[PDB]
């Protein structure tokens, strides 16, 4: 619904300052874990 | 190679320059910043 009566003219100002803005953000993260174990046992028994 | 002189000597171009730049209108110094008046 039209709330106001159509005016004969409009009050305006001119502004043509165009702007372009681009932002890029990259993030990386890497985490490597390594573990290792070894156990050894040797036994020897003798007699004649 | 037109200059401001060629614009000003022509009423249509002079008034286009005046209108498109709000040269007859003051500036409202609001707390949010300056804005041209209508």
Q: Which residues in chain B are closer than 8 Å to A9, comparing Cβ atoms?
A: none
Q: Which technique?
A: cryo-EM
Q: Which residues in chain A are closer than 8 Å to B25, comparing Cβ atoms?
A: 13
Contact yes or no for A14 and B21 at CB 8 A:
yes
Q: Exposed/middle/buried for A21, CB within 10 Å: 0-12, 13-18, 19+?
A: exposed
Cα–Cα distance, A33 to A30 (Å, whole number): 10
Cα–Cα distance, B23 to B34 (Å, whole number): 15
Q: Which residues in chain B are closer than 8 Å to A12, comparing Cβ atoms?
A: 38
Contact (Cβ atoms closer than 8 angstroms) between residue B37 and residue B26:
yes
Q: What is the resolution of this structure in A?
A: 2.5
Contact (Cβ atoms closer than 8 angstroms) between residue B4 and residue B14:
no
Token output for A26? 């990259």
């Amino acid at each position: 619904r039209e709330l106001i009566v159509r005016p004969d003219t409009l009050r305006a100002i001119i502004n043509n300052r165009a702007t372009i803005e681009t932002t890029t953000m990259e993030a990386e993260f890497t985490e490597t874990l390594m573990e290792s174990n070894y156990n050894s046992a040797s036994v020897k028994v003798s007699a004649p | 190679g037109d200059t401001l002189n060629d614009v000003i000597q022509d009423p249509t171009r002079r008034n286009k320059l005046i209108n498109d730049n709000n040269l007859l209108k003051g500036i409202i110094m609001g707390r949010d910043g300056p804005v041209p008046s209508s």
